[PDB]
Amino acid sequence: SMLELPPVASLKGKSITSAEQFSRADIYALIHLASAMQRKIDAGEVLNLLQGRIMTPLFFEDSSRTFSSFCAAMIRLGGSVVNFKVEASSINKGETLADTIRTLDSYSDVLVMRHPRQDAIEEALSVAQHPILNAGNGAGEHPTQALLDTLTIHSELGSVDGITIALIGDLKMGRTVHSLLKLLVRNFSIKCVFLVAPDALQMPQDVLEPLQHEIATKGVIIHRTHALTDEVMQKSDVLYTTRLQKERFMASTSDDAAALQSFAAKADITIDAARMRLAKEKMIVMHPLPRNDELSTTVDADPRAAYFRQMRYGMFMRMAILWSVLA
Amino acid sequence: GSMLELPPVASLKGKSITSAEQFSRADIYALIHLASAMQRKIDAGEVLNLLQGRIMTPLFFEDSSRTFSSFCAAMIRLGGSVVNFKVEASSINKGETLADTIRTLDSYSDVLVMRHPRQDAIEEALSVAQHPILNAGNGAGEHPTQALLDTLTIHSELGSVDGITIALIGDLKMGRTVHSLLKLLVRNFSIKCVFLVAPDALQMPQDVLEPLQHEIATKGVIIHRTHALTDEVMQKSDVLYTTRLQAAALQSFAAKADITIDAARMRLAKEKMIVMHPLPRNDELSTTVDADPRAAYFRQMRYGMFMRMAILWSVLA
Amino acid sequence: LELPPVASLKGKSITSAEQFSRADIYALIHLASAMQRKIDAGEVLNLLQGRIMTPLFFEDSSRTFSSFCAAMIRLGGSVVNFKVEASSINKGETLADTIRTLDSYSDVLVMRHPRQDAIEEALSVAQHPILNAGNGAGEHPTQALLDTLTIHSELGSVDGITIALIGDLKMGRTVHSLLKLLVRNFSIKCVFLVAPDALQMPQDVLEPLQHEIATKGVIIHRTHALTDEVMQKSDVLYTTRLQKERDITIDAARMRLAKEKMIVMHPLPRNDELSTTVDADPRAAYFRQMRYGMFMRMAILWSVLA
Ligand SMILES: N[C@@H](CC(=O)O)C(=O)O
Ligand SMILES: N[C@@H](CC(=O)O)C(=O)O
Ligand SMILES: N[C@@H](CC(=O)O)C(=O)O
């Protein structure tokens, strides 16, 4: 209870759209703030930092973790939430996205927006007076997931510089791995990244190209594979795996069918207890969730399974973010 | 010192809100001044604890963005709480009736906010409820709190409500907002002129106009029906209040372009006037108007929150 | 201070009527009464400020969802409004993973599920207490507690009553928990089981109770009708709806046969088994029952999270 909760001043009043916005020092300030929030909350302390402030969720596509995490974080800061549901709104009388933004912006202090269109967040930004926090924009980015994933690595392993990390699964559509790769390469001295995915679902060039300067000058090693090889298993300090983003492959064309099929047919990427016999002693398995069969329930009892603790780090990072934006 | 800064409107204490007809001119002004004061405190960053421990339950049988969210935000900004009941996930799917649903919410709540597709639904709810019910829209009947926030908007933007010329535009037949607004303005203020701008099949109902004939006569209000935003409607109106289309189809189509407000049509409007829309809008109110200082239909929603604070506080004080 | 939590419930999941002792039930009853006095006098409680309940409803509710949230709020607590329809279940997430998810952020989970054994599977992974708000045709333990608060407050005594349990007793999770709670912890004079044969109280509820039934000498009679005898002797007529998703009507005419001092109860919602003509009778306790439910849920949440 003697710990301060200094807001991160550079976040004040700003929208959060991309992992690109953050400096290394922003990241560590949010990490220590989140960690102090965790200590206070776990000790049973009641925070009243955002009394009388309102978050409104605008979720134009589904969420459990993200919506609930954000609501919980707001509440644990003493904040409030208006439970707006897009599916039961005047969008059903033809209301536009822009008008819907202005509508909840009339009542709220912060908007949390998730949308299947990558450019919808920009549209919202151009009409909103209050900050908007990007909780996922199609296959674009998920910048607060990247921050909490980094809190997880820091808290679990004790260090982010020097790690070897595998990014596994649907890298093409994974807004989580897009933001995470950006945030780690821009701001830390990463030893090596394994990009583990079948050919069709590899990390996009529009993510890798902007990073090419920093990759080359910081000496980050980048290796593509289509499988969890013995080498990937033995060298990785972090195995970060992801779900096939099937709802992004809905055009019913021969290509979407072949891309959907590649996860199981063009790659060997399942993590289970058999495969975990190859891992380091000091390493963690992470997954943004939800998972399907790429991450077996046989790993759940393993102490290196960090994907449940990841969600709780998530709540505290979101608290740190909300307090900083709104202080 | 909240009785100096935020005194509740006594006449509203513990009462249900169902119709624009139930308010006096003094009621309206007291709500306006209270709403202005709520706004000043909230905008200054001050945190209100007036309704801590009190619960509002929204009971929305129709879709809403403004009215649902507005009411929740207003309750929360008063320090109160909201129980997020949703009809579609409720025991109504086990054959439960409307009176029983009301009694249920009534056992937990301090105030109910009800929107329903049927006009007589409020009367049924009232006959059974022990706590106040606020009518958030009853079929094609009324929307009494929209009429209050609309009046707050006029008052705050133009300085005065007496003496205005207002056009009510669009689907006046099914528009519960214009039914409530026409009643609140004509009953309580001295309006100079109302233009009722609609194709014939969607004109203002007689059941709204006939009970008003006495106030119309005593105050000498001028009422003109048009099927277009004519040069004259555009030149004389202090307020253009337009609405979304909710024989009627054919007349609507034929009139659409003539009742559309866009930047080209605004070249004929007064320098000092406002465009209002309770929202949501479709094509009858062009996005080309959004940058015009006279476009008041976004600020109108924020006035709504403060007016709803004023209402909730007066009801529950 | 004036609202001592029930110590035995601290940090515990609530899954069955069986887990309560008579002393537990009375401590909750007196706590719920004290909570009701403070709330009805206008006092604001701040007991659970900063604590979160997440409802996890895999089926429809009106009363149960609302009264849990209202109770939480009136203790000063907060609610995270998780929806199953708008969630990552649609992306393929399992029930266990869903539980772990709400568990990362919440202090207490309130779970309702069409599968009888989903609550057990939930408990095997949750760190925080789960309150069973109804598991299939199994139990509804907090309904049985509020029903007993209702009987206590309305009649003054639970020992000695004659109670009729009426309707769909086979699928009625409410009458399962309530029979268990009454028979184990009180000395009931007589239970009428009023149901057609196909919907009678199940053997898996009656058999575990046979020892208590026999040693307290509870009378148990099965009928398929609300006979004049049931009507004249019952202190409580507890009636229920046909559980469709899985001569008994009470109307003003039938009520001419009831005692002066008795109550009609119904967990709700009702269909035509309980006529609107009964609603203005002072013995119609089924609306007041919902309000006792809110206070008993306050006593429960406070005791769980103190
Ligand atoms: N829940 C995360 C990961 C996923 O959906 O697979 C997201 O929305 O991006
Ligand atoms: N939102 C207003 C007007 C409209 O729907 O167009 C109402 O609910 O009545
Ligand atoms: N509402 C009670 C009784 C019923 O549904 O009829 C239950 O959930 O079990």
Side-chain angles (χ1 to χ4, degrees), chain A residues 144-164:
Chain A
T144 71
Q145 183 74 41
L147 293 155
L148 73 87
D149 289 340
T150 300
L151 178 54
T152 304
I153 297 166
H154 162 93
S155 313
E156 291 282 316
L157 299 181
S159 177
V160 184
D161 289 333
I163 59 173
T164 295

PDB file of all heavy atoms in Angstrom, chain A residues 144-164:
ATOM      1  N   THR A 144      -2.772  -3.946 -27.394  1.00  0.00           N
ATOM      2  CA  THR A 144      -2.746  -4.220 -25.935  1.00  0.00           C
ATOM      3  C   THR A 144      -2.457  -5.687 -25.612  1.00  0.00           C
ATOM      4  O   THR A 144      -1.925  -5.985 -24.537  1.00  0.00           O
ATOM      5  CB  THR A 144      -4.042  -3.771 -25.196  1.00  0.00           C
ATOM      6  OG1 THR A 144      -5.144  -4.628 -25.550  1.00  0.00           O
ATOM      7  CG2 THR A 144      -4.383  -2.336 -25.582  1.00  0.00           C
ATOM      8  N   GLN A 145      -2.801  -6.600 -26.519  1.00  0.00           N
ATOM      9  CA  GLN A 145      -2.357  -8.014 -26.404  1.00  0.00           C
ATOM     10  C   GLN A 145      -0.826  -8.081 -26.408  1.00  0.00           C
ATOM     11  O   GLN A 145      -0.244  -8.792 -25.609  1.00  0.00           O
ATOM     12  CB  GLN A 145      -2.884  -8.901 -27.550  1.00  0.00           C
ATOM     13  CG  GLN A 145      -2.502 -10.379 -27.405  1.00  0.00           C
ATOM     14  CD  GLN A 145      -3.347 -11.066 -26.292  1.00  0.00           C
ATOM     15  OE1 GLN A 145      -4.517 -10.817 -26.188  1.00  0.00           O
ATOM     16  NE2 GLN A 145      -2.737 -11.900 -25.486  1.00  0.00           N
ATOM     17  N   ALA A 146      -0.190  -7.358 -27.327  1.00  0.00           N
ATOM     18  CA  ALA A 146       1.289  -7.305 -27.407  1.00  0.00           C
ATOM     19  C   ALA A 146       1.913  -6.794 -26.092  1.00  0.00           C
ATOM     20  O   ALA A 146       2.907  -7.370 -25.588  1.00  0.00           O
ATOM     21  CB  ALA A 146       1.738  -6.436 -28.608  1.00  0.00           C
ATOM     22  N   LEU A 147       1.334  -5.737 -25.523  1.00  0.00           N
ATOM     23  CA  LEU A 147       1.826  -5.250 -24.220  1.00  0.00           C
ATOM     24  C   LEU A 147       1.703  -6.268 -23.090  1.00  0.00           C
ATOM     25  O   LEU A 147       2.633  -6.412 -22.282  1.00  0.00           O
ATOM     26  CB  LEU A 147       1.152  -3.937 -23.822  1.00  0.00           C
ATOM     27  CG  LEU A 147       1.532  -2.774 -24.748  1.00  0.00           C
ATOM     28  CD1 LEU A 147       0.419  -1.701 -24.716  1.00  0.00           C
ATOM     29  CD2 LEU A 147       2.917  -2.174 -24.391  1.00  0.00           C
ATOM     30  N   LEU A 148       0.580  -6.984 -23.020  1.00  0.00           N
ATOM     31  CA  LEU A 148       0.393  -7.918 -21.908  1.00  0.00           C
ATOM     32  C   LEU A 148       1.208  -9.167 -22.153  1.00  0.00           C
ATOM     33  O   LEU A 148       1.677  -9.788 -21.208  1.00  0.00           O
ATOM     34  CB  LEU A 148      -1.093  -8.254 -21.660  1.00  0.00           C
ATOM     35  CG  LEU A 148      -1.811  -9.173 -22.660  1.00  0.00           C
ATOM     36  CD1 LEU A 148      -1.626 -10.664 -22.278  1.00  0.00           C
ATOM     37  CD2 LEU A 148      -3.318  -8.806 -22.794  1.00  0.00           C
ATOM     38  N   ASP A 149       1.404  -9.524 -23.422  1.00  0.00           N
ATOM     39  CA  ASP A 149       2.249 -10.674 -23.757  1.00  0.00           C
ATOM     40  C   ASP A 149       3.684 -10.417 -23.296  1.00  0.00           C
ATOM     41  O   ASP A 149       4.381 -11.326 -22.852  1.00  0.00           O
ATOM     42  CB  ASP A 149       2.269 -10.900 -25.253  1.00  0.00           C
ATOM     43  CG  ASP A 149       0.958 -11.426 -25.794  1.00  0.00           C
ATOM     44  OD1 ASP A 149       0.103 -11.995 -25.035  1.00  0.00           O
ATOM     45  OD2 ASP A 149       0.810 -11.290 -27.032  1.00  0.00           O
ATOM     46  N   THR A 150       4.105  -9.160 -23.423  1.00  0.00           N
ATOM     47  CA  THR A 150       5.423  -8.720 -23.013  1.00  0.00           C
ATOM     48  C   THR A 150       5.534  -8.651 -21.479  1.00  0.00           C
ATOM     49  O   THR A 150       6.556  -9.053 -20.929  1.00  0.00           O
ATOM     50  CB  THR A 150       5.771  -7.387 -23.699  1.00  0.00           C
ATOM     51  OG1 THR A 150       5.744  -7.593 -25.116  1.00  0.00           O
ATOM     52  CG2 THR A 150       7.169  -6.924 -23.335  1.00  0.00           C
ATOM     53  N   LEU A 151       4.497  -8.147 -20.794  1.00  0.00           N
ATOM     54  CA  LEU A 151       4.403  -8.304 -19.331  1.00  0.00           C
ATOM     55  C   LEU A 151       4.579  -9.768 -18.932  1.00  0.00           C
ATOM     56  O   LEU A 151       5.331 -10.076 -18.016  1.00  0.00           O
ATOM     57  CB  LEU A 151       3.079  -7.762 -18.776  1.00  0.00           C
ATOM     58  CG  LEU A 151       2.782  -7.894 -17.271  1.00  0.00           C
ATOM     59  CD1 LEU A 151       3.902  -7.291 -16.344  1.00  0.00           C
ATOM     60  CD2 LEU A 151       1.369  -7.326 -16.909  1.00  0.00           C
ATOM     61  N   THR A 152       3.889 -10.673 -19.621  1.00  0.00           N
ATOM     62  CA  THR A 152       3.993 -12.114 -19.318  1.00  0.00           C
ATOM     63  C   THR A 152       5.449 -12.610 -19.432  1.00  0.00           C
ATOM     64  O   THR A 152       5.958 -13.255 -18.518  1.00  0.00           O
ATOM     65  CB  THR A 152       3.054 -12.927 -20.212  1.00  0.00           C
ATOM     66  OG1 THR A 152       1.704 -12.437 -20.060  1.00  0.00           O
ATOM     67  CG2 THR A 152       3.094 -14.397 -19.843  1.00  0.00           C
ATOM     68  N   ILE A 153       6.121 -12.304 -20.539  1.00  0.00           N
ATOM     69  CA  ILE A 153       7.507 -12.769 -20.757  1.00  0.00           C
ATOM     70  C   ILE A 153       8.406 -12.214 -19.637  1.00  0.00           C
ATOM     71  O   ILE A 153       9.128 -12.976 -18.963  1.00  0.00           O
ATOM     72  CB  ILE A 153       8.031 -12.426 -22.209  1.00  0.00           C
ATOM     73  CG1 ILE A 153       7.189 -13.142 -23.279  1.00  0.00           C
ATOM     74  CG2 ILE A 153       9.472 -12.856 -22.386  1.00  0.00           C
ATOM     75  CD1 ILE A 153       7.411 -12.612 -24.729  1.00  0.00           C
ATOM     76  N   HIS A 154       8.300 -10.909 -19.402  1.00  0.00           N
ATOM     77  CA  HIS A 154       9.093 -10.229 -18.376  1.00  0.00           C
ATOM     78  C   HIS A 154       8.899 -10.859 -16.990  1.00  0.00           C
ATOM     79  O   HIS A 154       9.882 -11.184 -16.313  1.00  0.00           O
ATOM     80  CB  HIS A 154       8.773  -8.743 -18.362  1.00  0.00           C
ATOM     81  CG  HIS A 154       9.200  -8.032 -17.106  1.00  0.00           C
ATOM     82  ND1 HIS A 154      10.420  -7.391 -16.988  1.00  0.00           N
ATOM     83  CD2 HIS A 154       8.558  -7.843 -15.925  1.00  0.00           C
ATOM     84  CE1 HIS A 154      10.508  -6.838 -15.792  1.00  0.00           C
ATOM     85  NE2 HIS A 154       9.393  -7.096 -15.127  1.00  0.00           N
ATOM     86  N   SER A 155       7.639 -11.052 -16.594  1.00  0.00           N
ATOM     87  CA  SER A 155       7.335 -11.596 -15.286  1.00  0.00           C
ATOM     88  C   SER A 155       7.694 -13.074 -15.148  1.00  0.00           C
ATOM     89  O   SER A 155       8.055 -13.505 -14.061  1.00  0.00           O
ATOM     90  CB  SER A 155       5.869 -11.392 -14.916  1.00  0.00           C
ATOM     91  OG  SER A 155       5.425 -10.068 -15.157  1.00  0.00           O
ATOM     92  N   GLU A 156       7.572 -13.847 -16.228  1.00  0.00           N
ATOM     93  CA  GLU A 156       7.817 -15.278 -16.162  1.00  0.00           C
ATOM     94  C   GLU A 156       9.313 -15.609 -16.239  1.00  0.00           C
ATOM     95  O   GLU A 156       9.796 -16.441 -15.477  1.00  0.00           O
ATOM     96  CB  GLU A 156       7.065 -16.014 -17.275  1.00  0.00           C
ATOM     97  CG  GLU A 156       5.521 -16.012 -17.107  1.00  0.00           C
ATOM     98  CD  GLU A 156       5.061 -17.030 -16.071  1.00  0.00           C
ATOM     99  OE1 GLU A 156       5.577 -18.163 -16.103  1.00  0.00           O
ATOM    100  OE2 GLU A 156       4.175 -16.710 -15.252  1.00  0.00           O
ATOM    101  N   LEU A 157      10.017 -14.982 -17.170  1.00  0.00           N
ATOM    102  CA  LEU A 157      11.414 -15.334 -17.473  1.00  0.00           C
ATOM    103  C   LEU A 157      12.410 -14.332 -16.874  1.00  0.00           C
ATOM    104  O   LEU A 157      13.610 -14.648 -16.696  1.00  0.00           O
ATOM    105  CB  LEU A 157      11.623 -15.478 -18.994  1.00  0.00           C
ATOM    106  CG  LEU A 157      10.791 -16.572 -19.706  1.00  0.00           C
ATOM    107  CD1 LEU A 157      11.133 -16.582 -21.192  1.00  0.00           C
ATOM    108  CD2 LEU A 157      10.993 -18.013 -19.107  1.00  0.00           C
ATOM    109  N   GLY A 158      11.914 -13.136 -16.559  1.00  0.00           N
ATOM    110  CA  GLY A 158      12.728 -12.143 -15.844  1.00  0.00           C
ATOM    111  C   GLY A 158      13.462 -11.203 -16.782  1.00  0.00           C
ATOM    112  O   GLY A 158      14.112 -10.262 -16.333  1.00  0.00           O
ATOM    113  N   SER A 159      13.368 -11.458 -18.089  1.00  0.00           N
ATOM    114  CA  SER A 159      14.093 -10.672 -19.089  1.00  0.00           C
ATOM    115  C   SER A 159      13.460 -10.843 -20.471  1.00  0.00           C
ATOM    116  O   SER A 159      12.972 -11.925 -20.802  1.00  0.00           O
ATOM    117  CB  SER A 159      15.573 -11.090 -19.130  1.00  0.00           C
ATOM    118  OG  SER A 159      16.278 -10.372 -20.150  1.00  0.00           O
ATOM    119  N   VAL A 160      13.425  -9.763 -21.249  1.00  0.00           N
ATOM    120  CA  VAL A 160      12.915  -9.812 -22.632  1.00  0.00           C
ATOM    121  C   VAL A 160      14.050  -9.721 -23.652  1.00  0.00           C
ATOM    122  O   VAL A 160      14.064 -10.491 -24.604  1.00  0.00           O
ATOM    123  CB  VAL A 160      11.811  -8.742 -22.937  1.00  0.00           C
ATOM    124  CG1 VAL A 160      11.281  -8.928 -24.352  1.00  0.00           C
ATOM    125  CG2 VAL A 160      10.659  -8.834 -21.925  1.00  0.00           C
ATOM    126  N   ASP A 161      15.011  -8.811 -23.443  1.00  0.00           N
ATOM    127  CA  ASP A 161      16.237  -8.795 -24.284  1.00  0.00           C
ATOM    128  C   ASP A 161      16.863 -10.198 -24.238  1.00  0.00           C
ATOM    129  O   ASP A 161      16.831 -10.851 -23.202  1.00  0.00           O
ATOM    130  CB  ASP A 161      17.312  -7.774 -23.796  1.00  0.00           C
ATOM    131  CG  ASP A 161      16.931  -6.283 -24.033  1.00  0.00           C
ATOM    132  OD1 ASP A 161      16.162  -5.923 -24.949  1.00  0.00           O
ATOM    133  OD2 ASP A 161      17.445  -5.438 -23.286  1.00  0.00           O
ATOM    134  N   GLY A 162      17.398 -10.663 -25.363  1.00  0.00           N
ATOM    135  CA  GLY A 162      18.169 -11.910 -25.392  1.00  0.00           C
ATOM    136  C   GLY A 162      17.359 -13.180 -25.596  1.00  0.00           C
ATOM    137  O   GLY A 162      17.941 -14.265 -25.695  1.00  0.00           O
ATOM    138  N   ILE A 163      16.021 -13.078 -25.657  1.00  0.00           N
ATOM    139  CA  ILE A 163      15.198 -14.282 -25.767  1.00  0.00           C
ATOM    140  C   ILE A 163      15.202 -14.826 -27.189  1.00  0.00           C
ATOM    141  O   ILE A 163      15.481 -14.103 -28.143  1.00  0.00           O
ATOM    142  CB  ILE A 163      13.681 -14.103 -25.318  1.00  0.00           C
ATOM    143  CG1 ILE A 163      12.970 -13.023 -26.139  1.00  0.00           C
ATOM    144  CG2 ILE A 163      13.544 -13.855 -23.820  1.00  0.00           C
ATOM    145  CD1 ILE A 163      11.472 -12.930 -25.860  1.00  0.00           C
ATOM    146  N   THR A 164      14.917 -16.117 -27.302  1.00  0.00           N
ATOM    147  CA  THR A 164      14.563 -16.745 -28.547  1.00  0.00           C
ATOM    148  C   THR A 164      13.072 -17.074 -28.500  1.00  0.00           C
ATOM    149  O   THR A 164      12.602 -17.735 -27.563  1.00  0.00           O
ATOM    150  CB  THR A 164      15.402 -18.015 -28.770  1.00  0.00           C
ATOM    151  OG1 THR A 164      16.768 -17.613 -28.906  1.00  0.00           O
ATOM    152  CG2 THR A 164      14.963 -18.762 -30.047  1.00  0.00           C
TER     153      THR A 164
END
